[PDB]
Amino acid sequence: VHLTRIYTRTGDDGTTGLSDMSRVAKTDARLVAYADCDEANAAIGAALALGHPDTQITDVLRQIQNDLFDAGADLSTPIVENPKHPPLRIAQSYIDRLEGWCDAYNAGLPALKSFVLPGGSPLSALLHVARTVVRRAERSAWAAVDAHPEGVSVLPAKYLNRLSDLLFILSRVANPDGDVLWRPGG
Amino acid sequence: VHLTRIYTRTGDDGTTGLSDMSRVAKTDARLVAYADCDEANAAIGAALALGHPDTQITDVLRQIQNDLFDAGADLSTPIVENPKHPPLRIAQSYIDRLEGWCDAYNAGLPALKSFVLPGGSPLSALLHVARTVVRRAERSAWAAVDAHPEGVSVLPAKYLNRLSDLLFILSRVANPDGDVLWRPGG
Amino acid sequence: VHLTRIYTRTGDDGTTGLSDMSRVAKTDARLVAYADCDEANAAIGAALALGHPDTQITDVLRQIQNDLFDAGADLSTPIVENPKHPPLRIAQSYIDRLEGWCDAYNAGLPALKSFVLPGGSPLSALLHVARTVVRRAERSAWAAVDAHPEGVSVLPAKYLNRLSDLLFILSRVANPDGDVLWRPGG
Ligand code: B12
Ligand code: B12
Ligand code: B12
Ligand SMILES: [K+]
Ligand SMILES: [K+]
Ligand SMILES: [K+]
Ligand SMILES: [Mg+2]
Ligand SMILES: [Mg+2]
Ligand SMILES: [Mg+2]
Incomplete structure (x- = not known):
């Protein structure tokens, strides 16, 4: 991975490249999946930068970003x-x-x-x-x-499945005074 | 609703359960709809936690989250x-x-x-x-x-239709000094 | 563009209007595209309001929002x-x-x-x-x-293509002390 000029214009026709350099449409299901991993990575980044987690939670989240x-x-x-x-x-x-x-x-x-x-x-x-x-x-x-x-492997999807459960648990640890709960129809 | 261990692994094959326990693909149009309600609920949560609204707007937003x-x-x-x-x-x-x-x-x-x-x-x-x-x-x-x-009922979509109009109104109330406006082609 | 009462209820049947007033389904690909521009515009807005950019970056981002x-x-x-x-x-x-x-x-x-x-x-x-x-x-x-x-013109997509490259560059300028980098498999 080399990030230099950043813009190459090779995607200006609506196609892009997989890691093996094979070409796919920019609507390809595979691109959508790892692009959404990127969006999730940015969301974690915002929790880090604006939420100021303690060191142990920071270390967990930084490992997830790497994952x-x-x-x-x-x-x-x-x-x-x-x-x-x-x-x-x-x-x-x-x-x-x-x-x-x-x-x-x-x-x-x-x-x-x-x-x-x-x-x-x-x-x-x-x-x-x-x-x-x-x-x-x-x-x-x-x-x-x-x-x-x-x-395509199923393990990325499995990883993301378990990860959202962890993020829910961590969201509760980050509210030590307790959470407000849903009152159905109230 | 019981949230205990959180991770059950019953979704590790790409299927999940509706409220009647019937099984659907994790790409099912119904799942996507209420997952996006969940994503919207989290966005309102961010406005509450980082935006520090006054008491009355806080009460409106908490009711919407419940809705x-x-x-x-x-x-x-x-x-x-x-x-x-x-x-x-x-x-x-x-x-x-x-x-x-x-x-x-x-x-x-x-x-x-x-x-x-x-x-x-x-x-x-x-x-x-x-x-x-x-x-x-x-x-x-x-x-x-x-x-x-x-x-599937249409009233969830109708509620969401009207809700984004309310959020636009509240976004203006939250900028009492006025908003910057689009200058077409400028 | 006239924003007055905001809610008109003409979208309550799952259809909406293009600029030429012709009617489209609320799942139409064109609507999804400019709705996502709107979502992108809001994300830039959050960077402006919570990120506190300096004058030069503020001016660039406001122009992008207009674009x-x-x-x-x-x-x-x-x-x-x-x-x-x-x-x-x-x-x-x-x-x-x-x-x-x-x-x-x-x-x-x-x-x-x-x-x-x-x-x-x-x-x-x-x-x-x-x-x-x-x-x-x-x-x-x-x-x-x-x-x-x-x-539909290709120039909107081309603009958005180049824009995400600029936002990456600006994200690096906003971390003058350097970024944490991915360690593959580490
Ligand atoms: C897919 C991809 C991404 C995807 C997914 C990447 C990921 N890992 O999540 C995502 C969406 C993240 C993405 C984002 C971006 N990307 Co990109 N990306 C690509 C791409 C196509 C593959 C890069 C990659 O992941 N290589 C990793 C592996 C798969 O490749 P490899 O290094 O050869 O490793 C092999 C082996 O050695 C082995 N291996 C390597 N390490 C290890 C370790 C272990 C333990 C094991 C077991 C095996 C192993 O595995 C691989 C098998 O081939 C490259 C093009 C390329 N071919 O380099 C562009 C590329 C690097 N991206 C590019 C750009 C600009 C970006 C963005 C800035 C786009 C933007 N504006 O948002 C962002 C930057 C994101 C960030 N936060 O830094 C450009 C850089 C252009 C330039 N000259 O500056 C490229 C070259 C694309 C292009 N336009 O030409 N990208
Ligand atoms: C659909 C669903 C969701 C959806 C939609 C839920 C919603 N209400 O918006 C969403 C995406 C929000 C979701 C998310 C989560 N979920 Co969930 N959810 C489910 C599910 C399938 C239904 C839950 C539900 O909404 N029950 C509400 C109603 C429909 O249930 P009910 O009380 O029986 O209602 C009946 C009657 O009593 C009556 N009724 C009840 N009250 C009232 C009031 C009035 C006025 C009226 C008229 C009628 C009425 O209506 C129904 C009759 O048909 C359950 C599994 C299950 N079958 O219970 C999992 C479940 C509870 N979820 C689970 C989990 C893990 C989560 C998440 C943590 C996942 C994650 N990591 O993000 C999050 C937590 C969200 C949060 N913020 O707290 C797990 C918990 C596992 C465990 N033991 O810990 C379950 C069991 C799924 C599973 N994996 O097996 N979930
Ligand atoms: C598509 C659209 C949007 C899209 C895209 C708009 C965009 N520019 O990005 C988006 C998603 C942004 C959207 C958002 C909203 N919208 Co809207 N929007 C529409 C719509 C259909 C077109 C408005 C528009 O962009 N006009 C601009 C151009 C295309 O139209 P024009 O002024 O006729 O310009 C023509 C020419 O003069 C020439 N031109 C004009 N200027 C210039 C300059 C140059 C240099 C050149 C070369 C040419 C040129 O170009 C056009 C060719 O015909 C109108 C309905 C309508 N038909 O007016 C609703 C409309 C304005 N939206 C409405 C609303 C409510 C909203 C939202 C509040 C919805 C919400 N709750 O989020 C938000 C507000 C967003 C915000 N931040 O302020 C309502 C307002 C209702 C009311 N009475 O209050 C309308 C009327 C729709 C409706 N429900 O009936 N909207
Ligand atoms: K690029
Ligand atoms: K779960
Ligand atoms: K409206
Ligand atoms: Mg799950
Ligand atoms: Mg509407
Ligand atoms: Mg590109």
Whole structure:
């Protein structure tokens, strides 16, 4: 990856390049998926810069941001038989880590009997924004799997699935005074 | 609604559950609609947490957040003849309330002869973000009606239609010094 | 453009109006494109209001916000043979200006050998959010071109293409102490 002049104009005809340099329409399901990972990465960035999380939560979120570029590398690289060089791929390893974090940060929390109205601390509010963008990215990743059941891995979608659960847990940790809950029809 | 362990892994195959436990693809038009309501709810949360609205506007926004979970409940519950239990549904009631708020908060504002360039106060800017996310949720709700003209109600989309108008009005109330306007081609 | 009562209820059946008053479904590709320009405009607004840019960047972003309504006017107005009045259209001039800003703001920056983890200053983070929303708007504009290769211009998409490159450059200028970089698989 070399970011130099940034604008190359090779996308001005509505096509763009996968990581193997093959050309796709800018509406291609695969591009949509890793573009949505990028949008999710930016949403986490806003939680970091405007929410001012403590060091431990900062460290978790920075690792997730790095994971999301691993997922984008995966989604942008077609799966091929016997590649010349090993591609970067999401592994179950990644999802186990998210689950370990889910359990650790959920341990100190009481169960909820309704949904949370997002808000409270700036950090909590921004983690809810990130949560919903990640969930949008997950849907796009499943759509890429549908379009390419052999060429696209399911593990990016699985990673994004578990990640939005972690972001919900972290949004609660970021409101130590408690959340306001939904009153159905009230 | 019980939120306990959060991650269940039952969505790791790209399917999820409606409120009646029936299974749908994670690209299903109905899921997209109430997921986008969730995304809109988070955007309002950001306006509350980073925009610091006064008490009365805070009360309006918290009621809208509650309404949006009512709309998500509606969209996630297929309409059936003679249900066992009365489902939670959006009613005209809800939209009449949004209209009453539109009229009250628009009363003190002069007419505009161009579009507003979003900005100014943090609250105004965040309300514009929420406004555009709500409009995206509205389009998804109409797409859900198209895919299920008998099983999905139109009132969620109608609520979202009127809601983005209210958020525009409130975004102006949140810039008492006035907004910067579009200069076509300038 | 006259903004008065705001809510008219003429969109309550899932249809809306183009600039020529012709009726389209609220899922129409053209509407999605200029609605996404609106969402991008709001994201820039948040960067202005919460990011506190200096005078030079403020002036650039306000011009871009104005451009995006020019782009929305273009996308909302079908191209016709010999129209009665000259329509507002994006022109190459707009993109040349974006390129001039890319070159000027990128001149003092070192090349990058990896991707940036969005974060740092609020301004940098919010410019990354805007960057990814603009890229989503670009995809929608290409989708509108595909649906209407004669009735929709390519210049809006081209403008949005170059614009996300500028927002990336400005996001780096807004982190003068440097960005955190992606470590593949680390
Ligand atoms: C897909 C892609 C992205 C996607 C997804 C990338 C991701 N990882 O999430 C996203 C949306 C993030 C994107 C964004 C941008 N991009 Co981009 N991107 C591309 C692209 C096509 C692939 C880059 C990539 O991810 N390579 C990573 C891997 C897949 O490739 P590789 O380095 O060869 O690694 C291989 C092996 O060595 C192995 N591997 C490598 N490391 C490791 C580690 C381990 C552990 C393992 C097991 C394997 C392994 O895996 C790979 C298999 O081939 C490149 C073009 C290119 N071919 O470089 C453009 C490219 C780098 N992007 C570009 C640009 C400008 C950008 C943006 C600035 C666009 C914008 N305005 O927003 C942003 C920057 C984002 C940021 N925050 O920094 C330009 C740079 C142009 C220039 N000269 O300046 C390029 C060249 C595209 C172009 N227009 O020509 N992009
Ligand atoms: C659709 C859905 C959502 C949607 C829409 C929900 C909405 N209301 O907007 C959204 C996207 C918001 C969502 C998000 C989340 N969800 Co959810 N959700 C579901 C689901 C399928 C339905 C929940 C619901 O809305 N119930 C409301 C109504 C429909 O339920 P009900 O009380 O039975 O209503 C009946 C009657 O009592 C009557 N009624 C009740 N009250 C009233 C009032 C009035 C006036 C009337 C007239 C009638 C009435 O109406 C119904 C009759 O048909 C459940 C699974 C399930 N089957 O319960 C998961 C579920 C609760 N969600 C789950 C989770 C994990 C989450 C998230 C944390 C996911 C994430 N990481 O983001 C977030 C949390 C959101 C938040 N801010 O708190 C999990 C919890 C797992 C666990 N044990 O911890 C579940 C169980 C799904 C699963 N994975 O198995 N979810
Ligand atoms: C498409 C559109 C939008 C789109 C795109 C607009 C854009 N420019 O980006 C977007 C999404 C931004 C939108 C947003 C909103 N909209 Co609107 N919009 C419309 C619409 C259809 C067109 C308005 C427009 O852009 N006119 C600009 C040009 C295309 O039209 P024109 O003035 O006739 O200009 C012509 C010529 O003179 C020439 N021209 C004009 N100037 C110049 C300059 C140069 C240099 C050149 C070369 C040519 C040129 O070009 C045109 C060719 O015919 C109108 C309905 C209508 N038909 O008027 C509603 C309308 C103005 N919108 C409306 C509303 C309510 C809104 C929102 C508040 C919705 C919401 N709740 O978010 C927001 C406000 C946004 C904001 N930040 O201020 C309502 C207002 C209702 C009322 N009485 O109050 C209307 C009337 C729609 C309706 N519901 O009936 N809208
Ligand atoms: K580029
Ligand atoms: K879950
Ligand atoms: K309206
Ligand atoms: Mg899930
Ligand atoms: Mg409307
Ligand atoms: Mg490009």
